[PDB]
Amino acid sequence: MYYESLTKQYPVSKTIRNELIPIGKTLDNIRQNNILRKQNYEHVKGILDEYHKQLINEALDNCTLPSLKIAAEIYLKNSDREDFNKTQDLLRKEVVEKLKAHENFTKIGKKDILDLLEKLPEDDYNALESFRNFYTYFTSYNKVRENLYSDKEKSSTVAYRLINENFPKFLDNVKSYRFVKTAGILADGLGEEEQDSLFIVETFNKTLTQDGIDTYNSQVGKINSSINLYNQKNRKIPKMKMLYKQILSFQSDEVLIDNVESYGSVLIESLKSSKVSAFFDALRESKGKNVYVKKSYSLEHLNLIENYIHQISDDIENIIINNETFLRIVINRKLAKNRKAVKAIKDFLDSIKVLERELKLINELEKDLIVYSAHEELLVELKQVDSLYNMKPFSTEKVKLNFNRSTLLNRNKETDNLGVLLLKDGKYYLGIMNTSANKAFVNPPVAKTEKVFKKVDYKLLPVPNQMNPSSEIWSKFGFKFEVEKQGYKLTYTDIDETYINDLIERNELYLFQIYNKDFSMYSKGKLNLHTLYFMMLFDQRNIDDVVYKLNGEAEVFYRPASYSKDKFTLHIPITMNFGVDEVKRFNDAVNSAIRIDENVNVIGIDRGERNLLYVVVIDSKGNILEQISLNSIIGYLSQVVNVVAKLVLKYNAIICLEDLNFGVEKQVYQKFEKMLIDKLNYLVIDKSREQTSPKELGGALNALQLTSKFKSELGKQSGVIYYVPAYLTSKIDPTTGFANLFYMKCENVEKSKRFFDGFDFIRFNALENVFEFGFDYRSFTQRACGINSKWTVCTNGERIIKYRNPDKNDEKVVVVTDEMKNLFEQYKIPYEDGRNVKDMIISNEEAEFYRRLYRLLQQTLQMRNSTSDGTRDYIISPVKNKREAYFNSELSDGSVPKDADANGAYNIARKGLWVLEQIRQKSEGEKINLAMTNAEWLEYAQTHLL
């Protein structure tokens, strides 16, 4: 009963360690990227690239696309928008079959391309040769290059480049040429004329190759030169737009800085050029007519134009941060090593990117010819900015993860990558993104197959001061009936398994299965606690009322192979009893729970000589309920701990341990403490796999917390655990309260004579065959040796003695009465009639007599008797108890201590009763003194006896 209030007392943090199993081609991606050592990998990629360019141009050289006429109508005529999108998809198809109809296409991606298709069209040959038998390295490369030959409306495909990008440009030039055929701009250099041939729809078929695009752009530049010349008439003529290239477009730290410095220099000059003013004042003079903005809407309703050009500010920040590139070329060992440089370069390219992103905000078929030509000239300067180099996951010994909208992107040897958690088929997986794919899960495509993952959405609202008088006057989950302790929730999103695969194949995602002995299709037995804590994160019963919070951070550690195993392990910090208010005065909270209850029992745990630990449970009046041992096994300290925890539940009990105050056996004891206090911080009993009723007492979501957070700052109490002096716990007859308090030494005869003159009598009991030594301890010491100091001590029984052996071990069994005879007989003392022989003993003059009398008395007083080999460790008293018997542990029936170690544990438990008397007898809240004096124990031992 008393402990059932001690749930949800304080929050606790754990880090959970689990192994990781690589899934799919993740381990290959990792191993492959451990290239180093330079190697021709990039050289062979370049060779594969140029045959891609060749095959592409050759498949499209003398090509002619049928639907081209259909589409060109829709666009040039007088919804047309959807018919164009449709006929564009038809065209994207028509490009792809022409690409797939080329010879050698079915050897794209297949290893079979290594042979003739590369050894024939050398430095290059040795580079190719070097990747025979190593073809899998281009797996990721192939998955990326696959998108060239796709009819899907994606920006990376050959069909999209030609049909969705270039073809509308080509047609828009056809629309512009009306003004150039008019006004007689017969272009300079177009000798003998017939430039009109460029703006017949059919001429586009000749621009499906890079070499036809070059030719088209070159001549159209000549026209634009004459167009720009036509500005002199003082209305204005739209310039022609250039077509983008066929899709053909980081060796060291020395080379890259010149590229950065160079492009930045070209760019800011281009951004200070007339290109920008021409775009702005064309965009202003368009009055917004036929200008469309991001899936789109037209500016014809307005105000906004001049709110838009004032992103001039993107030019100002490019300029500033280009100047800030003085940290690169003025102030600069490798570049990636530099705190500022890496940041200044990223700040620079980012600022460019936002300019491009801002530009791309514009763009339908009827769009304004002049505005969009100026926009295109300016944008051609920026579309070079796909710089997209790196400075790398599993290069390092660890990767740090974040599960949240919070990743820093720099400490440059410890930057956060995204972690995602994915559930499928009752298993748990960990995905960790390559930084270039961090946004793959921001808006994932809607799931369509049956084979899906459930991705964990990590919803956290930190520090609510995020966002109308001052401080004295809804897409989030916030639940209906400051929010800090409700501002966390996990929710789920179905994601199609093929999308996850695509990222792995592309080397953009590193997916692992989270594994422990309990996460297997072959798993058996109860759950390990850390498996349980982990499961409870995702268990809906916790999401409904949070006990377990996932701290957003996590770390992965990688030991690479060296035909040993590639080992990955995961550490996940978590908080348990998240959002509870920490109980201030926990020890009193327990002391007041005990104060209320009569029925409390005690568990005493002691260090033993033959048992490392001995546990003894006793009731409130002193009776032994259970006395159980180490070596009694029917990771060892974990078992005792798990046992002792059950006993606290089973017996409604507190725990009493030795106070290691003034003082190897005592090292495991301190380990046991630590483990025992650790355990009782947060105790969970129900370790079942099915986990049916975890909200009950001691279930996962209602753990008990019976002890205070371990810190070394500890006094004599830690919750239900109390510490008591070890004084005379093992060397005391529990049935009498008797202990050997004689401070003895055979110093000399004078001081031996009136040591033995302190006894009331020394006599023989012929009937019981023992010698009796009667005395009062007061006659021997000034100490307060309990409330009974009168005793009669008898040469009762056998004793085990270590003894002086010329051969240096031995031990023997002695019967003190018969030796006490042999000595008295040797020295002619008349004992047999039962007189008091005291006056006759102290009359002996020889010291040898007293040496041997001391030894016999000492041996009589030797209550604990042991064997070097554990064969025996028992306690025998030399005093008769309430049962007219001499206490002997070997004759125990379980109602008394079985051995000396048990006696220690028993008498430690008894002192707990004394503290229970202290706790109950004090007031609510007052400090409780637990310093038990040696005199109090002897008093308690001699009165609460048996």
Residue numbers in the entry: 1 to 36, 42 to 83, 88 to 130, 134 to 246, 253 to 267, 277 to 321, 373 to 380, 389 to 418, ...
From the paper:
Cas12a is a programmable nuclease for adaptive immunity against invading nucleic acids in CRISPR–Cas systems. Typically, Cas12a exhibits a bilobed architecture: a recognition lobe (the REC1 and REC2 domains), and a nuclease (NUC) lobe (the WED, PI, RuvC, BH, and Nuc domains) for cleaving nucleic acids.
Strikingly, both apo and RNA-bound Lb2Cas12a are present in the asymmetric unit of the crystal. The 20 nucleotides of the crRNA in the complex are well defined in the electron density map. In apo Lb2Cas12a, the N-terminal REC1 and REC2 domains (REC lobe) and the C-terminal wedge (WED), RuvC, and Nuc domains (NUC lobe) are arranged in an elongated conformation, with the REC1 domain and Nuc domain at each end. Two flexible loops (Asn33–Asn45 and Lys478–Thr498) connect the REC and NUC lobes. The overall 3D structure of the Lb2Cas12a+crRNA binary complex adopts a triangular, compact conformation. Superposition of the apo Lb2Cas12a and Lb2Cas12a+crRNA binary complex structures demonstrates a 103° rotation of the REC lobe with respect to the α-helix of the WED-I domains of the crRNA complex in its compact conformation. The flexible loop (Leu477–Lys493) connecting the REC and RuvC domains of apo Lb2Cas12a transforms into an α-helix in the compact conformation, folding back at the C-terminus of the REC2 domain. Significantly, the loop-turned-α-helix (Leu477–Lys493) harbors a hydrophobic patch that interacts with Trp871, linking the REC and NUC lobes through the BH and RuvC II suspension helix.
